[PDB]
Design a protein around this ligand. Structure first.
Ligand SMILES: CC(=O)N[C@@H](Cc1ccc(C(F)(F)P(=O)(O)O)cc1)C(=O)N[C@H]1CCCCN(Cc2ccc(-c3ccccc3)cc2)C1=O
Length: 106
């Protein structure tokens, strides 16, 4: 159950996810997963980042879910569950701004 996951924030807005992530104490990779505001059945992985060019900022990655079962950001790399997707991206940065580190504070 994804709703049992502490990083699953469910139905919160894009602006709200940014308010939470734009916290000075958040190191790179702080994250949360929420429902998409516009695509039914899609989710969004919101991630905090930091660099000297942009400073603290947030990136949003759409996560697709196939009725055939897979969850993925890129169709080339799919997972059997949202939980497995989160675990993979906590170890590999791949095309993300940073690997996922810890759940966002509220
Ligand atoms: C308005 C906005 O923020 N759009 C996002 C895409 C986006 C659009 C819709 C939503 C949503 F539906 F959930 P919402 O409720 O907010 O409407 C979330 C994310 C975006 O453009 N992000 C960038 C985020 C930074 C990377 C560049 N890129 C393309 C890309 C390139 C590579 C990969 C990738 C990731 C991991 C592994 C391999 C490749 C993913 C996206 C993106 O999509």
């Amino acid at each position: 159950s994804i709703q049992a996951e502490e990083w699953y924030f469910g139905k919160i807005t894009r602006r709200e996810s940014e308010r939470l992530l734009l916290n000075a104490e958040n190191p790179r990779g702080t994250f949360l997963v929420r429902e998409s505001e516009t695509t039914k059945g899609a989710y969004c992985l919101s991630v905090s980042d930091f660099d000297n060019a942009k400073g603290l900022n947030v990136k949003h990655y759409k996560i697709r879910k196939l009725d055939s079962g897979g969850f993925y950001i890129t169709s080339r790399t799919q997972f059997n569950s949202l939980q497995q997707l989160v675990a993979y991206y906590s170890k590999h940065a791949d095309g993300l701004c940073h690997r996922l580190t810890t759940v966002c504070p509220t």
